[PDB]
Design a protein around this ligand. Structure first.
Ligand code: BN8
Ligand code: MN
Ligand code: MN
Length: 234
């Protein structure tokens, strides 16, 4: 099976989500053919030179999955668009483009974070265009770390446009799309390329975890607890 997760929004102040993700990496992920992280792995990112200990803790845990034979892939979210090749090397992850078409057991599947499908929010899309401009990213990353941290602290949900969904699935000629961003886990039926098509949405990790599991036989949207919930009787 191939696994998809997104919208964990990991951060120091939410250790329960981190512990849930570490358990996921040490258990479920080790049995997978591959693990894809469709953006918003971290609640914030100001560059790969950040000494935040959580970053190294997460990189080591993902690296252990990769070393166990499970390739891991990352598409950027709107929270963590500055994740770069240094973190890719630390974690063993492979960075992918904003849209990718996958062969999953003979099923062609488009994957993306999902924010680019929210074409009704033109203000957001203009902000996105600016922070994805390479010369702007370069200038921001050149600032001292302490300045970047102040900017980020100081700076501290839209849904998809149905026609943007059809356009993306016809551009890639797929009948299956998996994304996150909207935090509304669901399976939507539509029509694309003259045939029934499906859009599968991941959940954010709020109280419990969420993943999509693709097998040769089906597509599974799965909700599971962060920790081992030991039975006990009354
Ligand atoms: O979860 C969700 C969220 C719902 C959708 C909300 C969309 N809005 C949103 O995401 N905002 C946002 C805010 C702060 C951060 S940040 O703290 O990580 N960090 C990033 C780098 N960043 C920067 C970069 C560059 Cl290049 C240039 C500059 C500037 F401005 F100084 F020039 C700053 C400083 C701030 C990241 C994202 N959807 O699924
Ligand atoms: Mn998110
Ligand atoms: Mn997002």
């Amino acid at each position: 099976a191939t696994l998809f997760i997104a919208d964990l929004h990991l951060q120091t102040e939410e250790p329960a989500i981190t512990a849930g993700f570490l358990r996921f990496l040490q258990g479920e992920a080790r049995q997978a053919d591959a693990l894809y992280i469709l953006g918003d792995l971290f609640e914030a990112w100001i560059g790969d030179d950040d000494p935040n200990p959580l970053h190294q803790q997460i990189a080591s845990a993902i690296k252990a999955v990769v070393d166990a034979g499970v390739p891991c892939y990352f598409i950027h979210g709107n929270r963590d668009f500055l994740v770069g090749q240094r973190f890719a090397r630390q974690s063993g992850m492979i960075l992918l483009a904003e849209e990718e078409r996958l062969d999953l057991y003979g099923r062609e599947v488009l994957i993306m974070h999902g924010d680019t499908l929210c074409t009704d929010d033109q203000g957001y899309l203009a902000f996105r265009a600016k922070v994805h401009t390479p010369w702007i990213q370069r200038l921001f990353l050149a600032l001292p770390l302490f300045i970047r941290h102040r900017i980020a602290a100081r700076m501290r949900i839209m849904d998809v446009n149905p026609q943007a969904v059809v356009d993306a699935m016809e551009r890639h000629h797929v009948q299956w799309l998996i994304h996150g961003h909207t935090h509304r886990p669901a399976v939507h039926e539509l029509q694309a390329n003259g045939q029934p098509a499906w859009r599968v949405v991941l959940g954010a990790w709020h109280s419990e975890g969420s993943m999509v599991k693709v097998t040769p036989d089906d597509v599974e949207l799965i909700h599971f607890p962060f920790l081992e919930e030991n039975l006990y009787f009354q």
